[PDB]
Design an enzyme around this catalytic site. Structure first.
Site, mmCIF file in Angstrom:
data_model
loop_
_atom_site.group_PDB
_atom_site.id
_atom_site.type_symbol
_atom_site.label_atom_id
_atom_site.label_comp_id
_atom_site.label_asym_id
_atom_site.label_seq_id
_atom_site.Cartn_x
_atom_site.Cartn_y
_atom_site.Cartn_z
ATOM 1 N N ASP A 180 11.296 11.029 0.721
ATOM 2 C CA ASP A 180 12.014 9.934 -0.014
ATOM 3 C C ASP A 180 12.925 8.869 0.900
ATOM 4 O O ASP A 180 14.198 9.366 1.129
ATOM 5 C CB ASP A 180 12.989 10.238 -1.185
ATOM 6 N N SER A 185 11.111 -9.576 3.740
ATOM 7 C CA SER A 185 9.878 -9.974 3.868
ATOM 8 C C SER A 185 9.750 -11.609 3.777
ATOM 9 O O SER A 185 10.889 -12.267 3.174
ATOM 10 C CB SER A 185 9.244 -9.640 2.539
#
Length: 330
Positions: free
Chosen positions: A35, A199
Site C-alpha cells: 500500500d 498530473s
C-alpha cells in the site's frame, strides 16, 4: 541488494493485489497488500481477536526465534475509507522477494474492522508511503522500504500491476524490459506523507487532451481512480445511460456499454487506461447495472490514482533524497 516479488489480484475484479512476505525465523509467509498510500506493516496474528479472524493466515511471534516485543509500542490506523486496525508491535526479520530487512517493525493486530475480517485473502498490509505517516507510538517506526533503502542498489521500488493478471514489485532496480518507450519522471511532494504529484491533464476516449493540473496520490492500496467531479462527469457523459447513483455510491453504467479509454498526463507524456480497466462489473450478482472504475474524489479531500490508473503503467517510486515518480507505458 535487490528484491523481486510477484503480486496477484485477490479476485476477478482486481479489487486488490497480494504479495507473499516472509516474516520471522523460520519464515512465516503471509500475503500482504502493498500500500503506497500508508506506512504501517501490520498483520493478522495470534493476538487478533478470534471473532475478527476469518480464513487469514496469522503471524505467531512466539514461534519466531527472531521476534522481539517492541516494549510499550502500540499502533492504531484509520484508513480514508473508514476501515481500521490496531494492536502492539514486534520487531522481526522480514523478506520480500529475496530482499531481507532485520529489525523491521511488524505491527500485530489485536483488532481489525469488518472489511479486513471479510477479506479472507489479505493477511495484512505493507505500507510504502513515507515513514512520517507511520502510526506507532510513542516511537514512530520506519517502513520496509525506508529500512531497506541504504542497502538497495538504487533507492527505488517499482509497481507493475497486471490487469486481471499477476504483476511485480521490484526493490532496488528498474527492470528496463518491463516497459515500452521511456519513463517520464515527475516531482513529488512529501508534505502530507504520500507519493503526491501533479498530473498535467486528461482526455476521454479519442477526445482532445485537456491541459489542467490535477494533484493526487499514487496509491496501490486503493482500487479505483478518484478524480475531480468535473473530470469524472466529462468521462461518464460519453457512456450512454451512465449516471451517478447515490443509492449505489457512485457512477454506474449499463453493462451493455462499451467504455471509452481515459488518458492522464505525466509531464508531456500520456498514460492510456483502456476502457475495459474501468469496468468493475455488476453492482450485485445478476444486475445489468455495472460499477464504474472512475469515480469522484469530492468528499475524499484528495485525488487518488489507485490501481485502475497504476496498472496501466510501469511506475517508479524513486526514494532518493528528492523523491520523484516515474511512469512508462507497457
Amino acid at each position: 541488494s535487490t528484491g523481486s516479488a510477484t503480486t496477484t489480484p485477490i479476485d476477478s475484479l482486481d479489487d486488490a493485489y497480494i504479495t507473499p512476505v516472509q516474516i520471522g525465523t523460520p519464515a512465516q509467509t503471509l500475503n500482504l497488500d502493498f500500500d503506497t498510500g500508508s506506512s504501517d506493516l501490520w498483520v493478522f496474528s495470534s493476538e487478533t481477536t478470534a471473532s475478527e479472524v476469518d480464513g487469514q493466515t496469522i503471524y505467531t511471534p512466539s514461534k519466531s526465534t527472531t521476534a522481539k516485543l517492541l516494549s510499550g509500542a502500540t499502533w492504531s490506523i484509520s484508513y480514508g475509507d473508514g476501515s481500521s486496525s490496531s494492536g502492539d508491535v514486534y520487531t522481526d526479520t522480514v523478506s520480500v522477494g529475496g530482499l531481507t530487512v532485520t529489525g523491521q517493525a511488524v505491527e500485530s493486530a489485536k483488532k481489525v474492522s469488518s472489511s479486513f475480517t471479510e477479506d479472507s485473502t489479505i493477511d495484512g498490509l505493507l505500507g510504502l508511503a513515507f515513514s512520517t505517516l507511520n502510526t506507532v507510538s510513542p516511537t514512530q517506526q520506519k517502513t520496509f522500504f525506508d529500512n531497506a533503502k541504504a542497502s538497495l542498489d538504487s533507492p527505488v521500488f517499482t509497481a507493475d500491476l497486471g490487469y486481471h493478471a499477476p504483476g511485480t514489485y521490484n526493490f532496488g532496480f528498474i527492470d528496463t524490459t518491463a516497459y515500452t518507450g521511456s519513463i517520464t519522471y515527475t516531482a513529488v511532494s512529501t508534505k502530507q506523507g504520500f507519493w503526491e504529484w501533479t498530473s498535467t491533464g486528461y482526455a476521454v476516449g479519442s477526445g482532445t487532451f485537456k491541459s489542467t493540473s490535477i494533484d493526487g496520490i499514487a496509491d496501490t492500496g486503493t482500487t479505483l481512480l478518484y478524480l475531480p467531479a468535473t473530470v469524472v462527469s466529462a468521462y461518464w457523459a460519453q457512456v450512454s445511460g451512465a449516471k451517478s447513483s447515490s443509492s449505489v455510491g457512485g457512477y454506474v453504467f449499463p453493462c451493455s456499454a462499451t467504455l471509452p479509454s481515459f488518458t492522464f498526463g505525466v509531464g508531456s507524456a500520456r498514460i492510456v487506461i483502456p476502457g475495459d480497466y474501468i469496468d468493475f462489473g455488476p453492482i450485485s450478482t445478476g444486475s445489468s447495472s455495472c460499477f464504474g472504475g472512475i469515480q469522484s474524489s469530492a468528499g475524499i479531500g484528495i485525488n487518488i490514482f489507485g490501481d485502475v490508473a497504476l496498472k496501466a503503467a510501469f511506475v517508479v517510486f524513486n526514494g532518493a533524497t528528492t523523491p520523484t515518480l516515474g511512469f512508462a507505458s507497457k
